UniProtKB/Swiss-Prot annotation, chains A, B, C:
<comment type="subunit">
    <text>Soluble monomer. Homotetramer. A dynamic intracellular population of tetramers and monomers coexists normally and the tetramer plays an essential role in maintaining homeostasis. Interacts with UCHL1. Interacts with phospholipase D and histones. Interacts (via N-terminus) with synphilin-1/SNCAIP; this interaction promotes formation of SNCA inclusions in the cytoplasm. Interacts with CALM1. Interacts with STXBP1; this interaction controls SNCA self-replicating aggregation. Interacts with SNARE components VAMP2 and SNAP25; these interactions allows SNARE complex assembly and integrity.</text>
</comment>
<feature type="repeat" description="4">
    <location>
        <begin position="23"/>
        <end position="33"/>
    </location>
</feature>
<comment type="similarity">
    <text>Belongs to the synuclein family.</text>
</comment>
<protein>
    <recommendedName>
        <fullName>Alpha-synuclein</fullName>
    </recommendedName>
</protein>
<feature type="binding site">
    <location>
        <position position="16"/>
    </location>
    <ligand>
        <name>Cu cation</name>
    </ligand>
</feature>
<feature type="region of interest" description="4 X 11 AA tandem repeats of [EGS]-K-T-K-[EQ]-[GQ]-V-X(4)">
    <location>
        <begin position="1"/>
        <end position="33"/>
    </location>
</feature>
<feature type="repeat" description="3; approximate">
    <location>
        <begin position="8"/>
        <end position="22"/>
    </location>
</feature>
<feature type="repeat" description="2">
    <location>
        <begin position="1"/>
        <end position="7"/>
    </location>
</feature>
<comment type="function">
    <text>Neuronal protein that plays several roles in synaptic activity such as regulation of synaptic vesicle trafficking and subsequent neurotransmitter release. Participates as a monomer in synaptic vesicle exocytosis by enhancing vesicle priming, fusion and dilation of exocytotic fusion pores. Mechanistically, acts by increasing local Ca(2+) release from microdomains which is essential for the enhancement of ATP-induced exocytosis.</text>
</comment>
<feature type="modified residue" description="Phosphoserine">
    <location>
        <position position="53"/>
    </location>
</feature>
Length: 66, 66, 66
């Protein structure tokens, strides 16, 4: 029982080529108690295991009341 | 029982070529207690396992009352 | 029982070529307690397993009252 890798090439959970070019003459960002994401975000993961778990949150406003 | 990889090339959960070009002369962003995502977001994952789990949330406003 | 990969090339859960060009002269974004997504979002996943789970939410406003 299990996994057997015999002479194998595996890419799992990969973000491996991202090219970005940005040209802005004038920019303004105003944020009051919130999430603002202007930049590049690259997240690679193989396994996440749990009850009520958040994985790879880029822009996230969690205001919960249980 | 299990998995056998004999001389195999596998790409699973991959985001591997993304090209972006952006040209803006003037920009403004105003955000009050919310999520605003202007940038590139690349998320690769193989496995997520759990009850009530969020995976790969880019713009997310969770205001829950259980 | 299980899986056998003998000399196989498999791409599963992949987002591997996305090209974007954007030209804006003037832009404004106003957001009050909500989700606004202007940028590129690429999400690749192989497996998600759970009761009441959200996978790959790009623009999401969850205001629940259980």
């Amino acid at each position: 029982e299990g996994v057997l890798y015999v002479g194998s090439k595996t890419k799992e959970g990969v973000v491996h080529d991202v090219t970005t070019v940005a040209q802005k003459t004038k920019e303004q960002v105003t944020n009051v108690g919130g999430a603002v994401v202007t930049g590049v975000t690259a997240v690679a993961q193989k396994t996440v295991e749990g009850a009520g778990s958040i994985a790879a949150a880029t822009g996230f406003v969690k205001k919960d009341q249980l």
